[PDB]
A = this chain, B = another copy of it.
């Protein structure tokens, strides 16, 4: 059916090799995707380098921002096509795509264009020996060619989260979306083309990681930065790969996030929240909770309530009425998730609900669905409690003491995010500041303001993006010092 081409130096192109994009709802082929080779990656980088010297480089910040708003306008004008593309690749509920995925991707471009317009830099006066003094000022320049490599859990959102500020700062871009979700990125290339974005400014390359476009990108001496979102292991590999070039790097990596429910929490709200944080996108979001700690006094009641709500979840088609969960991204990913399902049992988990695959008796049985799953009875040292599963699952465990549960949350090689449920003023602020992660929510989950810094600690990442931090990462900060 559909064909997904690379976009290089203003032109769509095919490749020697192609791979399949497969609908996880039913296992049916959606499209053929051309895998760019080493030579085409080179062509992309060189074009990106030259574009920096072209008309793109002559644009005022205001004109550049106007054009980026045009890109956002073009996505909005093809809104439903973008919805259809995200849904096809990933099986995500249509409502989620219409309210989260696509509008956030548009908001990424608008927000960074606006920040580009309002941003400024610094002026430092200094005294000198002769009493004439000196002036030091800083400027933001384009960093150069930014290599962007993105994952499949929020395809257009996380892709544009890198591409928008890269372009807002006047860089050119070579971007490699996940092989699992190539569609919406390809449509973005079309939007770029139609908006009149100069050739070479934005380049789209398809493929995999090792011995494919992804690796080739990280190895190319022509890039100035590599921004990456994906597994921690992949982060380290890429960090080694750019080391000889001393390329700027920004990494958003894996997590094993906890949710903590204190005794004074609003229990019904906490249950709804943990339900959402565990099972949204079938638990395939980096921000999902897979470890949950609940105060002993309310533990059993909490687990009972969550069981009931988890069992009311509708698992099925993306446009099915009242659907809460679609399938996992792919059969390979499902294999990995079920392997963890077994392991949890072997490690001695009580299976509160789920633990298998739903029986549909239609085409969905050919897809890659699993059941939302809850475990109890596992130790803090259990693999299923420590390793990132990336499916619709959580383990729940009681605790007694505040300092205790803080230490248990922090006892991890990851540190992406955490959610805390409490109605107590002091406790919200005291506990939150003690959690060793980049992002804590109190009495909510997945709230994101694009102005805030975002990033992880430990294995969950390196550096920060968002607001001023993106404006700093995607720019050369240069100092000019004038003796007066």
Task: Give the chain B neighbours of A382 by CB distance below 8 A.
Answer: none
A310 to chain B, nearest CB (A): 22
Whether A345 is near chain B, meaning CB under 8 Å from some CB there, is no
Contact of A443 among B60, B242, B440, B483 (CB under 8 A): B483
Residues 357-395 of A contacting B (Cβ, < 8 Å): none
Complex-state Cα separation, A167 to B227, whole angstroms: 29
Chain B binder among A41-49, A157-165, A334-342, A471-479: A471-479
Q: Judging by beta carbons under 8 Å apart, are A138 and B123 in contact?
A: yes
Q: Judging by beta carbons under 8 Å apart, are B480 and A440 in contact?
A: yes
Residues 122-164 of A contacting B (Cβ, < 8 Å): 122-128, 131-132, 134-139, 141
Q: Judging by beta carbons under 8 Å apart, are B240 and A432 in contact?
A: no
A76 to chain B, nearest CB (A): 13
Q: Judging by beta carbons under 8 Å apart, are B246 and A458 in contact?
A: yes
Task: Give the chain B neighbours of A224 by CB distance below 8 A.
Answer: 457-458
**How many residues belonging to A are interface residues under a CB distance threshold of 8 Å?**
92
Residues 377-431 of A contacting B (Cβ, < 8 Å): 422-430
Task: From known contacts A62-B127, A127-B61, A477-B453, infer whether A253 and B243 are also in contact, taking CB-CB under 8 Å.
Answer: no
Task: Give the chain B neighbours of A62 by CB distance below 8 A.
Answer: 127
A331 to chain B, nearest CB (A): 29
Q: Judging by beta carbons under 8 Å apart, are B452 and A479 in contact?
A: yes
Whether A121 is near chain B, meaning CB under 8 Å from some CB there, is yes
**What 0/1 readout, one digit per residue, does chain A (103-128) give for beta carbons within 8 Å of chain B?**
00000000100110110111111111
Chain B binder among A182-190, A201-209, A460-468: A460-468
Chain B binder among A8-16, A87-95, A231-239: A231-239
Whether A219 is near chain B, meaning CB under 8 Å from some CB there, is no
Whether A210 is near chain B, meaning CB under 8 Å from some CB there, is no
Whether A73 is near chain B, meaning CB under 8 Å from some CB there, is no
Complex-state Cα separation, A132 to B447, whole angstroms: 13
Contact of A482 among B239, B425, B454 (CB under 8 A): B425
Task: Give the chain B neighbours of A136 by CB distance below 8 A.
Answer: 447, 449, 452
Task: From known contacts A123-B123, A132-B426, infer whether A483 and B137 are also in contact, taking CB-CB under 8 Å.
Answer: no
Complex-state Cα separation, A120 to B141, whole angstroms: 21
Complex-state Cα separation, A106 to B103, whole angstroms: 27
Whether A248 is near chain B, meaning CB under 8 Å from some CB there, is yes
A159 to chain B, nearest CB (A): 22
Whether A27 is near chain B, meaning CB under 8 Å from some CB there, is no
A104 to chain B, nearest CB (A): 13
Task: From known contacts A118-B451, A127-B62, infer whether A439 and B478 are also in contact, taking CB-CB under 8 Å.
Answer: yes
Whether A199 is near chain B, meaning CB under 8 Å from some CB there, is no
Complex-state Cα separation, A126 to B236, whole angstroms: 35
A53 to chain B, nearest CB (A): 11
Nearest B residue to A428 via CB reads B425
Task: Give the chain B neighbours of A122 by CB distance below 8 A.
Answer: 120-123, 452
Complex-state Cα separation, A452 to B424, whole angstroms: 25
Contact of A236 among B117, B244, B483 (CB under 8 A): B244
Whether A58 is near chain B, meaning CB under 8 Å from some CB there, is yes
Contact of A424 among B423, B462, B480 (CB under 8 A): B423
Whether A308 is near chain B, meaning CB under 8 Å from some CB there, is no
A422 to chain B, nearest CB (A): 7
For A132, A237, A432, A484, the residue with the greatest tally of chain B CB atoms inside 10 Å of its CB is A484
Nearest B residue to A415 via CB reads B476
Q: Judging by beta carbons under 8 Å apart, are B232 and A236 in contact?
A: no
Task: Give the chain B neighbours of A467 by CB distance below 8 A.
Answer: 120
Task: From known contacts A115-B118, A118-B118, A246-B458, infer whether A452 and B483 are also in contact, taking CB-CB under 8 Å.
Answer: no
Task: Give the chain B neighbours of A242 by CB distance below 8 A.
Answer: 239
Task: Give the chain B neighbours of A137 by CB distance below 8 A.
Answer: 123, 135, 137
Complex-state Cα separation, A373 to B41, whole angstroms: 44
A108 to chain B, nearest CB (A): 14
Task: Give the chain B neighbours of A29 by CB distance below 8 A.
Answer: none
Residues in A lying within 8 Å of B, measured CB to CB = 58, 60-62, 111, 114-115, 117-118, 120-128, 131-132, 134-139, 141, 224, 232, 235-237, 239-240, 242-249, 251, 253, 422-430, 432-433, 435-444, 447, 449, 451-455, 457-464, 467, 469, 472, 476-484
* 13 A–B pairs (Cβ distance < 8 Å), ordered by A: A60-B127, A120-B122, A123-B123, A124-B451, A125-B139, A126-B447, A135-B429, A235-B246, A236-B244, A246-B251, A246-B459, A439-B479, A454-B479
Other than A239-B243, A449-B481, give 7 A-B pairs with Cβ distance below 8 A: A58-B131, A124-B449, A132-B430, A246-B458, A425-B442, A426-B483, A440-B480
